[PDB]
Write a protein that binds this ligand. Sequence first.
Ligand code: 2ZZ
Ligand code: K
Ligand code: MG
Lengths: 225, 215
Amino acid sequence: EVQLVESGGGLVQPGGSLRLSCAASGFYISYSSIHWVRQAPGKGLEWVASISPYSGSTYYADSVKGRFTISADTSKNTAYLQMNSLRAEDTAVYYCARQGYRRRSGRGFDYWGQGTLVTVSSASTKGPSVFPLAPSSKSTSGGTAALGCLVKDYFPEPVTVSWNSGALTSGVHTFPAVLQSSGLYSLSSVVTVPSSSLGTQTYICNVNHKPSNTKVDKKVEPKSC
Amino acid sequence: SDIQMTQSPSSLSASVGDRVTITCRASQSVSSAVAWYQQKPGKAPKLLIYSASSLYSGVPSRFSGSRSGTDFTLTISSLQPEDFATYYCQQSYSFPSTFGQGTKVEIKRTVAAPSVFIFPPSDEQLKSGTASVVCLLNNFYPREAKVQWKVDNALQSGNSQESVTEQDSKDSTYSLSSTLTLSKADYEKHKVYACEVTHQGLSSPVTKSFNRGEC
RNA sequence: GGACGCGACCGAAAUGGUGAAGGACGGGUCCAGUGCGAAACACGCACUGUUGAGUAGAGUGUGAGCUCCGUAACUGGUCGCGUC
Ligand SMILES: CC1=N/C(=C\c2cccc(Br)c2)C(=O)N1C
Ligand SMILES: [K+]
Ligand SMILES: [Mg+2]
C-alpha cells in the first residue's frame, strides 16, 4: 500500500537547476521524516537531504549544502528536491525514502521510490548509431557463433535493447553502457547462436532511445566477405 | 567531524548455504542507530535491520545484526539464492547521515573459461570516420579476466573500454565486452587486429584476430 | 499551706521585618541522557542524572527552616502584692 514515486529527473547542463518530486501514497508524509538519497552509476548510496516532521527542520549532506533545498507540500502529499548549481558529479539516480515509524522501524528507511535519473552534462541529447556485430566467417569457439549490435554515441542514458521483438532472449548479453571521452555513451548487445543457421535464421536487434525519439531495428547478417 | 562508516569486505564470494558476515565500523559512537539494507541491480534498497540488531518486519530471520561498541555486523546464517546482492550499512545517530561503501555478495561456482569472439568494425561505421573493434568474453568465472589489444602485434593502451555484465542468474557466469576505438585513418594503416585473453579457466592465453581487408 | 484577683518576669502557638546558607530543606525551571506522543531538532509527557546548575537569585515562590530585631494568642511557669 505504501509507495513513493519520484519524478522530474532528466538532462541538465552544469550550473543549471532541476527540481525533483517525491509523490507519497498509502501514507501521509506529515507524520514522517522524508529523505533524499542518491546513487551515482556503479557507486554506493549517498545520503543527500532530509526534512523532519512537526518542526520542518532540514538537514543536508556537506557535498550539496547551499545548493540543494528539500521541502514538502502536504496538500499534495509530495516532497521536493530543488537542485541549483548542478555539477557533473551530481549525476546519479535520486531516491526518496520514508524514515519509518520509530516504534516499528527505529530510524530505518522502510520505503524507497524506484528512483529518477539525473544527468548533469554539457553534452547534447543524441540518438545512437546502431552497427552490426557480424558473425565471423568461422564457425567455432563454443560450438556456436556470436553476434550482436553496437549502440554507439547516444545521450543521455538510458537505452533499451531486445532481439527479435523479445522472441529471442536466451544467450543474450546486453552490457552496461560506457561513458566515452566524447561525453557520449556506448554499449553492445550480443547473443550466441547455432552457427549452422546463420544465413537461415533472422536476427534483429531492437534499440530504443526514448530521450531522442530514436527507435531503430537492425538486422544482423554474416558479412559477404 | 562527519561520522565514518567503514564497510568491509567490498566484495564477497560464497556458496548457497554458507554463513557470511559483513562489517561496518563507525569512526565514533553512533549508539545503536545503525540500519542495514539489501540492494539488487536496478532496484531500490530494502530495509533489513534497524537499531543495529532488530529484524525489520517481513525480513527472514537468517538475517541478523549485532553491535560491538562502534563495530556493527550483518550476518546471513545460511545464504539462499535470492540473498546474493549488495548490502549497505547506515548510521543515523546524527546528521549528516552516512552509508557504508557497500558489500557485493556473489555466488561461487566452478571455474569456467570464456568463449572469445572478435568483431571488426562494420563498413557502415567506417564511412563515418571512426572504427570500433569489439572483443567478447562470453560466460566465464571467476570475474577476473585480462584483455589486451594488439594492432600489427603492437600492444594498445588507453584507447579501449571494458564493460562486464552482472553475474548470470542461471549459470552464475560473467560476460565482458572490450571496445577498441580508432580513427578510420589509423585503422586503415594496419592489418592484423587481435585481442589476447587471459583467464584462470584458460590452459593458456587465447588470441582472436582478423586481417583488415580480408573480412 | 491552698484558692481567687492584679502586676512583673520567663516561656509560647502565631506573625511582620532581617541576611547567611546550594542541593543533606525543598519545589519550580533549565541542561544532559534514555523511552514515548505518527516526533533524532523544535514542542509535550514519563524515567534517570547534582563528581549536571547562582545562595549577587537569572523565580508570577528566592517557599520552608535557620541567623538576628520586633508584635503576640494563652492552656504555661515563677515571684511579689491584696483578700479568703
Ligand atoms: C544555578 C541553579 N541551580 C539550580 C538548581 C539545583 C538543584 C539541585 C542541585 C544543584 Br547543584 C542545583 C537552579 O535552579 N539554578 C538557577
Ligand atoms: K533554587
Ligand atoms: Mg526533546
